Structures are given as C-alpha cells and as structure tokens.
Scaffold this active site. Structure first.
Site, PDB file in Angstrom:
ATOM      1  CG  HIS A  60       2.590  -3.987   6.347  1.00  0.00           C
ATOM      2  ND1 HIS A  60       3.307  -3.977   7.190  1.00  0.00           N
ATOM      3  CD2 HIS A  60       3.148  -4.130   5.150  1.00  0.00           C
ATOM      4  CE1 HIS A  60       4.314  -3.913   6.757  1.00  0.00           C
ATOM      5  NE2 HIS A  60       3.996  -3.836   5.304  1.00  0.00           N
ATOM      6  CG  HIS A  90       2.264  -7.299  -0.997  1.00  0.00           C
ATOM      7  ND1 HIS A  90       4.396  -6.776  -1.430  1.00  0.00           N
ATOM      8  CD2 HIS A  90       1.985  -5.481  -1.166  1.00  0.00           C
ATOM      9  CE1 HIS A  90       4.368  -5.880  -2.011  1.00  0.00           C
ATOM     10  NE2 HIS A  90       3.192  -4.984  -1.929  1.00  0.00           N
ATOM     11  CG  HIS A  92      -2.045  -3.449  -1.614  1.00  0.00           C
ATOM     12  ND1 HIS A  92      -0.900  -2.149  -0.196  1.00  0.00           N
ATOM     13  CD2 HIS A  92      -1.182  -3.168  -3.329  1.00  0.00           C
ATOM     14  CE1 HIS A  92       0.151  -2.578  -0.551  1.00  0.00           C
ATOM     15  NE2 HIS A  92      -0.005  -3.338  -2.119  1.00  0.00           N
ATOM     16  CD  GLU A 102      -0.899   0.723  -2.317  1.00  0.00           C
ATOM     17  OE1 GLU A 102      -0.020   0.544  -3.039  1.00  0.00           O
ATOM     18  OE2 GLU A 102      -1.431   1.265  -1.160  1.00  0.00           O
ATOM     19  CG  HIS A 115       1.885  -4.189  -5.671  1.00  0.00           C
ATOM     20  ND1 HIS A 115       1.739  -3.183  -5.018  1.00  0.00           N
ATOM     21  CD2 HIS A 115       0.710  -2.983  -6.981  1.00  0.00           C
ATOM     22  CE1 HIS A 115       0.850  -1.637  -5.439  1.00  0.00           C
ATOM     23  NE2 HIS A 115       0.068  -2.111  -6.373  1.00  0.00           N
ATOM     24  CB  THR A 194       2.004   1.459  -2.174  1.00  0.00           C
ATOM     25  OG1 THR A 194       2.329   0.880  -2.229  1.00  0.00           O
ATOM     26  CG2 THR A 194       2.533   2.390  -3.610  1.00  0.00           C
ATOM     27  CB  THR A 195       3.820   0.779   2.457  1.00  0.00           C
ATOM     28  OG1 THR A 195       4.637  -0.225   2.172  1.00  0.00           O
ATOM     29  CG2 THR A 195       2.551  -0.030   1.839  1.00  0.00           C
TER      30      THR A 195
HETATM   31 ZN   LIG Z   1       2.246  -2.677  -2.476  1.00  0.00          ZN
END
Ligand SMILES: [Zn+2]
Ligand SMILES: [Hg+2]
Length: 255
Positions: A60, A90, A92, A102, A115, A194-195
């Site tokens: 992901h 990581h 996004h 995000e 993040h 957020t996951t």
């Molecule tokens: Zn994140």
C-alpha cells in the site's frame, strides 16, 4: 483493503467500523476557522542521530524504517507532552499532480503527503502506543511539483529494487532532516491513522510550508506496484484517503 473500487476507502467501515468514528483523519484544514493558540510551543525535531535501516513495499506504500530501540531521532515540543520516537516514514501520492495528499488546505490537494511516524516513548513499544489516545504523533509534510529535492534522491533511486509488494532493501545512513521544510509553522488536531486499523491514537502535526520535488521525482513513485511479483501489475497510485468530518474537533495554529 486497498484503494480500488471494490476494496477502497468507502468499504473500510465493513472490516474497520472505527472508520466512522469521532476522530478520524485526514481532514480539511480551513485556515480561517483554525484557532491561533499562543500557548502552543515550538516544535522540537532532533533527527541528528537517526538510524535508517531498510525500505519496504508493504503493498500500500513503501516504508523507510528506523531503529527505535533508543532515543536517536525524537520529536517533542509543540502540542506534545513527553518524547516520541521515529519508527518510520512513508508517502501518499496521486496518479496526477493535482491529487495525492491526504490532508487538504482550504480544500486544496497537493501531489503527495509525507508522514513521519513517532510513538510516545512512556508506553515502551509501538504496540502499546496504539492502545492510547496520546500514543502516536504524526508529522505531515505536503509535497508539490517544482524543483528537485536533493535529499529525496536517495529514496527515489532505491525504488527500482522494491518494485513489488513484499520486497525490501537495506537502507542505512539516510538522514530525514533533508525532507524538512524551512519553517516549522504547524496546524495540530487529534486524529487517527489514515490506513486500517485506523486507530484514533494520533496527534497530527501538519506543517504549513510544503517541500517541492521535481516531476521526475514523483514519476518514480508512480512506477511502484501494489501487486506482488508474478501477479498482474497494478501501479501504486492514489494511495490516499479522502478527508473525513472534523466533528466538533478544533484545529489549532502555532502561527
Ligand atoms: Zn500515512
Ligand atoms: Hg488509541
């Protein structure tokens, strides 16, 4: 769970009912409704001693992992009480340059979002931290397409090696300081991961000033795969979750 039509964010509530909770992230940062709070102390980022270990594609995203067996890279000050250890970072990103972040600012979406994840060192390990309201501290940095970011090139070059889900590569002597903007002005509010598992254990610290990256640096992000080696290729793009309802929570500004 994924970011596809059939296992996307709109479906996470099924397996993860907290998806519909009271303090979910991301959210829209309305800069005119944000409350300027003078009692807010300056952010304290001590990453001089950071120890990067490896990079891994978990299906992901890709995670840069740090050694959090000691207080090498920590985060304190700001809205936080006590010290938080850096465990990983990581991103996004989007399929195109007009999406990817995000968190949004006045509804404005950036190309990517960084993040840096930290856990409250009074809970002893990350595991236990995810069991507390003040367990985690996420440092969010927006990314925009402009000039190259020298300090990101190392990451960008390693991606070839972790193309597919499950792959990893040694990734030592990487200094996160090179991903930091000039200013440390920030917005702060109580949120969540957020996951999945989407735990409402996080103190969000979103920096006002974005870092710029070259179009060719973002392109390499978009070459990654969600799929494992030997499976039909599904490019790792749009791995971001839409803004959630603030629901009575108040967003505060350090400026
Ligand atoms: Zn994140
Ligand atoms: Hg929690």
């Amino acid at each position: 769970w994924g970011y596809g039509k059939h296992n996307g964010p709109e479906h996470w509530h099924k397996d993860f009912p907290i998806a519909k909770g009271e303090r979910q992230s991301p959210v829209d940062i309305d800069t005119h409704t944000a409350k300027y709070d003078p009692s807010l102390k300056p952010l304290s980022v001590s990453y001089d001693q950071a120890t990067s270990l490896r990079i891994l594609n978990n299906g992901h995203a890709f995670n840069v992992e740090f050694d959090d067996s000691q207080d090498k890279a920590v985060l304190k000050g700001g809205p936080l009480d006590g010290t938080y250890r850096l465990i990983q970072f990581h991103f996004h990103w989007g399929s195109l340059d007009g999406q990817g972040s995000e968190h949004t600012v006045d509804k404005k979406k950036y190309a990517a979002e960084l993040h840096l994840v930290h856990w409250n060192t009074k809970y002893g390990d990350f595991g236990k931290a995810v069991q507390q309201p003040d367990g985690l501290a996420f440092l969010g940095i927006f990314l925009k397409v402009g000039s190259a970011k020298p300090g990101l090139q190392k990451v960008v070059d390693v991606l070839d090696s972790i193309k597919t889900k499950g792959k990893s590569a040694d990734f030592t002597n990487f200094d996160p300081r090179g991903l930091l903007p000039e200013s440390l002005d920030y917005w702060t509010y109580p949120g969540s991961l957020t996951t999945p598992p989407l735990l409402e254990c996080v103190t969000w610290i979103v920096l006002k000033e974005p870092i710029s990256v070259s179009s060719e640096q973002v392109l390499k992000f978009r070459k990654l795969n969600f799929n494992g080696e030997g499976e039909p290729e599904e490019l790792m793009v749009d791995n971001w979750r839409p803004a959630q309802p603030l629901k009575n929570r108040q967003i505060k500004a350090s400026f």
